[PDB]
Design a protein around this ligand. Structure first.
Ligand SMILES: Cc1cc2nc3c(=O)[nH]c(=O)nc-3n(C[C@H](O)[C@H](O)[C@H](O)COP(=O)(O)O)c2cc1C
Length: 169
């Protein structure tokens, strides 16, 4: 597989999303699925295409496994990689920090030389602030299983379909 997906999760939602994205891409032969709790930052070097999934916890913080590796990301060579992101969040409970983690990771990784692809429009959501917004789009797939579970399936399907192109699929 030429695409590597690395996710982190506290309660399992992000994992489930990760599994669905893998299946939408076409399976294990298309995307390698990895829990970041088991990886080294160095594992990220193998791929030209990455998908980073991370939920936001504790009012605007990264999920703990991502927080653990955060400082090691500098050691990865992201030059030339295309990276797409996804995150789980709750726009009602955390309106002022909706999907911040996705935003924090994207800012770090993009600054290291990768190109973000996979922007997602903000129509259909309601939140006050987010670190993951740029030019009025999310930098990646914003999922909200707490408030909008009925939208998830479609959001994933649409997003993957847009991604396919950018990943040379
Ligand atoms: C105590 C607590 C704090 C949270 N903080 C945030 C937050 O700052 N921003 C946000 O978008 N969602 C926040 N969430 C919502 C979660 O990210 C969300 O429930 C997600 O589905 C959890 O994903 P996981 O199972 O992969 O960890 C919080 C949830 C809890 C329970």
């Amino acid at each position: 597989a030429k695409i590597g997906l690395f996710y982190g999760t506290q309660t399992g939602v992000t994992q489930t999303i990760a599994e669905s994205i893998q299946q939408e891409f076409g399976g294990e032969s298309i995307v390698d699925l990895n829990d970041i709790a088991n990886a080294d930052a160095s594992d990220l070097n193998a791929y030209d295409y990455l998908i980073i999934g991370c939920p936001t916890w504790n009012v605007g913080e990264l999920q703990s496994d991502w927080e653990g590796i955060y400082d090691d990301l500098d050691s990865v060579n992201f030059q030339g990689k295309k990276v797409a992101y996804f995150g789980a969040g709750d726009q009602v409970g955390y309106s002022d920090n909706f999907q911040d983690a996705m935003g924090i990771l994207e800012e770090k990784i993009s600054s290291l030389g990768s190109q973000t692809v996979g922007y997602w429009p903000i129509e259909g959501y309601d939140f006050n602030e987010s670190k993951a917004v740029r030019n009025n789009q999310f930098v990646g797939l914003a999922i909200d299983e707490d408030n909008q579970p009925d939208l998830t399936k479609n959001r994933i399907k649409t997003w993957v379909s847009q991604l396919k192109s950018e990943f040379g699929l």
